Symmetry: C3
Subunit: 445 residues, 3 copies
């Protein structure tokens, strides 16, 4: 080579793979640019952010772009690639000091090894890049996928090691706390689902360590910017603790009445109307004889590319038939006739019903539930079946899907950091009962 | 089922099918939502409209969305679906009291029976929904498709009953008057084409009756809103009656000079330049060996998804060869090199020419003509071959396509309501001669 | 035919084809509309431009639309059609008097003969139309494609006469000077590449002559409009002559240091990082077993349909293997990780490297180079390897791609008109050495 260049290369071991960080050579005009690599699956992340904000619209323009290249795979030719841009956006957005100068993160997979998934590699890149960007960014985050094989947690399992796994769980967070979780599981227990979040959280620490050690070795100057010096509740967010709490002083283990109708539509193979509170979903299942999924899930939304519902799919997936036994392509559509935005934990329940109505031999019924948490000092309240307004509240909100015996899907967005464990278990164990309750009703239809 | 719910279900017979209206259960947060059904072909219409307008831009934001679902048909996967959103928008827009708070109608076919077309079912839904919406909406409209089989008008014929039919005509209107007509016909007479509009108008009455009876049983409070207290003609719209009338005091049976050129293009199978007045169309026909149409019609429009020209297609369709006799796929494109917006009644003539030039054995020549009507009190004037400015005038404008012996297509947008019949026949019979005149010229080329 | 009409038809011979101009019959409401035709390959160009400008944003809204029709080819169904809209926009934009009333040119191929390419036919149309449009337009331009067969320049060669040709070059300009050149060549010499630009420039004169003769016979009144009475350099554009010249007083034969890395990516068949100055390209080559190109070139650009890089393709194309010898589909992607906008003359170099790394038996290495020219009176300076800011300077900027022995691609945008030849040869011969220099470095990797 010719080499006028200076790339700084840090290389640490990770699980059984050797990660490798590299900055300084590519995209210099960019606030920060890193080439992250793991067993030659390489994502090239970039961070560019403003300089100065504009009239303070009082909002934070933050966008992340994940794009997978075909030459990356050695092939000749936005997907659910926007879903992975979702796994990058979720855990880093709240790591920004209370900020409105715009930032743009862009991960581009430039090389791929089918065994080493680029999605967590891209997170690490988004992590490193933002750290070197001296842009006000609370610490560095790590990223870890956790499987379960031969009954124990596994770090960043391969694409086919995942075949034996009963778990697929992604965790990202800081040295101090976990910030986001995306799990798909095989009806595993609240505890098993938790030995996962902590397992992976303890593992990311290696990543975070190498990043700060590299920000020292090459990281750019942290920008100064401290910031300036009209309705919101705090009040619902303040009577919130051992106070009655509001529109429907639902106690706090109250879940709301349901409406469960089956065979709602004439020419569909299966159907179910599920309405609980302000939300409503007309779910249908239709049988039939890229690719393949033989299990398809679609969302039709009302008026004026939500995949947080790949969640609903993950939620249902655990109960879908073995396929050698029910050989059919199954397609579930959830039509949200009405509501607040927040969900399908309801489309999970909806789908579970439609499928049954459709005559699909699903391993068990499945239901979804949205939980919430508020914590001041050390008095925390777990909210069961949170409604539209009980969110955007702060601290923590999570979702859980599953049958009567276990969890099929787990999602968590923890924004405060004083929450470690028994707490997370008080919550994750209350949500369990609240979930069995719902399954209780659905079972009557 | 579980049933916390209250759906109000009205069910009336219609022709030989049993329609069924249902409100109250689905989409409650919506101003109005109805599930209309006919022999298990169900459309779920919704109406949402503002609350208060904004600065009175002085325009009426009204949009309709028709969407057909694949699970509706029990299948695993905007079209001309926007054309059906056209059949809903046309007849209801003028039923709004002289209104600028925005309204949004959304029909979504949720179930389908291939025999019972969802398009008129969606109209009825848009009708019922808007009525229950207490939103200022002049009465309720009905909807009816009319066929001709064994020589007599038929109500909502099936998809294959339509195979024997020489007519396909859709009529929508109020208890008092017809508002819009979309017909395709087999060179049937002005009278036959009219026994159709009235036949179907008398039939919709059943629909309208059940709707008002249901608005009483469940309809929401009619909103109050009455409204406030700078160029337009009225003058052309006032000298309009037995006065000379304008830029080209075209009498009122005047049709304008034509320009008919054939074989205009070198490598096309057939071609024709048709220019009359300000409008001009370069039409071509190209032979060859979803789907199928073996007769295709496309519009290329000039500069800075018009299907009111499916009309031109319908206009031409009646003369296309039997296909066992001319076995070829025929594709007509109309390139509007110039004009006013208003048409292809000219692309009908254009196409008829191009096809002939292309050597396509069409049953006869076909021509299009745009008519217009103004009525104050009881003095009405029928305008032959209306031009760009003679429209947007008010009262009534209609189009007719066909050969020398009969009508192939009929379109009507009646906005005033004092027009019943001989009148419509004076007009529909004047347009006939005005049409034969044009065929007279085309025949020389 | 019926003929109320008056089309003015001028017909001149061109090379071995008979061109034909026609105005007056079609699109009369348009400022100017012409039907240009050559051996029955007809483009129908149209010109519409404003009337009056608006607040003088101080910019010139000029858009050109080239669209090829399928019925044009007698077939039943934006491309690189936007690239041909590029060959129309390039040579006419600078022919506008120093103008901000918006203009819109639209060429639509309405008939095609596979032998007579519509692209230069559309240019002539854009030429004629704009001339008749009396819109302030400096003279009339011609257009000519030049081949090389049996060792001599050829005028508008057929699609298959081009099979024997070592040249494909398009030139457009005024009676006085050449304005734009787009060439693809087979490693032909700077001189051969020049006997081409002048050959075709002398040939277009016929076109220009017939156009002015037709503007006289039918051209519309030239509009009056003369125009009104805050940072830009002139200074860099003034010290520019025999003065040191700037950020990096690069002499003026200086080309900047390079960074040449190969095998940069893990799972790609070939790869190369090429970084020179502010620009950087991560190029890759991937082998494999409409259509066909078996040589593909794609550009991935960074953040917030550039085909001036079909140029990079043309640049590389001359060295790609004979295909009977290397039978594989080759796909090159250029990922611009960073820069100024200006290029791939760098993706040419990048690609040449990636291909070599990929093991593709390319006939020789190839490199790209961006040149520039400034001229006041008769003192002109040729700038080698111009950078981001040395452009948008004025007078002339051009690019050249090729191996060590000859030119593979040549692009020129001449905006001033005092430049005739030795000058163009001083430049085109300096760029040659500057190009061999770069090949000198690449050869070390």
């Amino acid at each position: 080579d010719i080499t006028l260049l200076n790339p700084i290369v840090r290389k640490f071991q990770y699980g059984q793979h050797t990660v490798t960080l590299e900055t300084g050579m590519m995209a210099r005009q960019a606030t920060a640019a890193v080439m992250v690599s793991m067993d030659d699956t390489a994502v090239f992340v970039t961070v560019v952010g403003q300089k100065k904000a504009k009239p303070g619209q009082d909002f934070f323009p933050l966008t992340v772009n994940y794009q997978e290249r075909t030459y990356a795979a050695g092939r000749i030719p936005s997907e659910g690639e926007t879903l992975i841009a979702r796994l990058i956006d979720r855990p880093i957005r709240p790591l920004f000091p209370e900020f409105v100068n715009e930032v743009q993160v862009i991960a581009t997979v430039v090389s791929v090894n089918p065994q080493v998934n680029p999605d967590i590699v891209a997170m690490i890149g988004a992590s490193a890049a933002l750290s070197l960007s001296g842009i006000p960014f609370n610490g560095p985050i790590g990223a870890a996928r956790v499987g379960y094989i031969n009954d124990q947690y596994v770090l960043n399992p391969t694409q086919d090691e995942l075949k034996e796994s009963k778990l697929d769980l992604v965790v990202a967070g800081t040295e101090a706390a976990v910030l986001m979780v995306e799990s798909e599981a095989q009806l595993l227990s609240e505890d098993q689902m938790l030995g996962a979040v902590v397992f992976g959280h303890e593992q990311q620490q290696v990543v975070i360590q190498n990043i700060n050690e590299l920000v020292k070795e090459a990281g750019k100057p942290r920008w100064d910017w401290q910031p300036e010096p009209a309705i919101e509740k705090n009040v619902v967010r303040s009577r919130v603790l051992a106070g009655e709490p509001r529109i429907d002083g639902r106690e706090k283990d109250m879940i709301r009445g349901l409406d469960v109708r089956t065979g709602v539509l004439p020419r569909t193979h299966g159907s179910a109307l599920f309405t609980r509170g302000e939300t409503q979903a007309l779910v249908t299942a239709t049988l039939g004889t890229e690719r393949t999924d033989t299990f398809l899930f679609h969302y039709n939304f009302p008026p004026y590319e939500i995949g947080h519902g790949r969640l609903a799919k993950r939620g249902v997936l655990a109960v879908m038939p073995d396929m050698d036994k029910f050989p059919y392509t199954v397609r579930v559509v959830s039509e949200i006739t009405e509501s607040n935005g927040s969900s399908s934990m309801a489309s999970v329940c909806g789908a579970s019903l439609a499928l049954m109505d459709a005559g699909v031999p699903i391993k068990a019924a499945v239901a979804g539930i949205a939980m919430g948490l508020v914590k001041e000092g050390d008095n925390y309240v777990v909210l069961s079946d949170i409604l539209g307004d009980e969110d955007h509240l702060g601290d923590m909100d999570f979702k859980v899907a599953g049958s009567r015996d276990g969890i099929s899907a787990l999602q968590m967005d923890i924004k405060i950091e004083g929450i470690t464990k028994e707490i997370m278990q008080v919550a994750l164990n209350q949500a369990k009962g609240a979930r069995l309750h719902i399954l209780g009703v659905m079972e009557q239809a």
